[PDB]
Amino acid sequence: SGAIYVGNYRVVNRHLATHNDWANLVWEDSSRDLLVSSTTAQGCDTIARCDCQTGVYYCSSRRKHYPVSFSKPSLIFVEASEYYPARYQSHLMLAVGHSEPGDCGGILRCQHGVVGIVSTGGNGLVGFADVRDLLWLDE
């Protein structure tokens, strides 16, 4: 689990969104595994605006942060899980690293701020849903 809090937005994995997230829906993209809901409290996270390919992600199944190199956001074929059939996830970034389903929502960060959130994994790879392109998160 985990979310990003910026302005009056909460960014979560679409597959982990709650009933309140869907009741306060701002934007969702199934192909990206992202959902943004509205919040009453002001968020204070900074979204990275950059094309860094290095950063640090929180891994709840290790209680550790790991520095990684990751690919630029792209359309990557993702195997079926309990949440989606097999399909292309868009705006996905891969790194070599440990990931388990419950690690979804872990934040990937660079020097500029939040890059994205843990969304996918398998065979020693961790996939992160990019948020850096969502410029509207910042007004």
Q: Which residue out of 45, 91, 103, 104 is catalytically annotated?
A: 104
Residue 69: CA count within 13 A, CB half-sphere: 0
Question: How many other CB atoms are found less than 10 A from the CB of residue 133?
Answer: 12
Q: What are phi and psi of 48, to 5 degrees?
A: -60, 135
The answer to whether residue 60 forms part of the interface with ligand A1AM8 (CB under 6 A) is no
Taking the complex as a whole, the smallest distance from the CB of residue 3 to ligand A1AM8 amounts, in Å, to 12
15 in catalytic set: yes
CA–CA gap between residue 138 and residue 101 (Å, rounded) = 29
Applying CB under 6 A, which of residues 81, 90, 110, 112 lies at the interface with ligand A1AM8?
81
33 in catalytic set: yes
CB 3 within 8 A of CB 94: no
110 annotated as a binding-site residue: yes
- Taking CB under 6 A as the binding criterion, the range among 18-26, 85-93, 100-108, 131-139 that sits at the site for ligand A1AM8 is 100-108
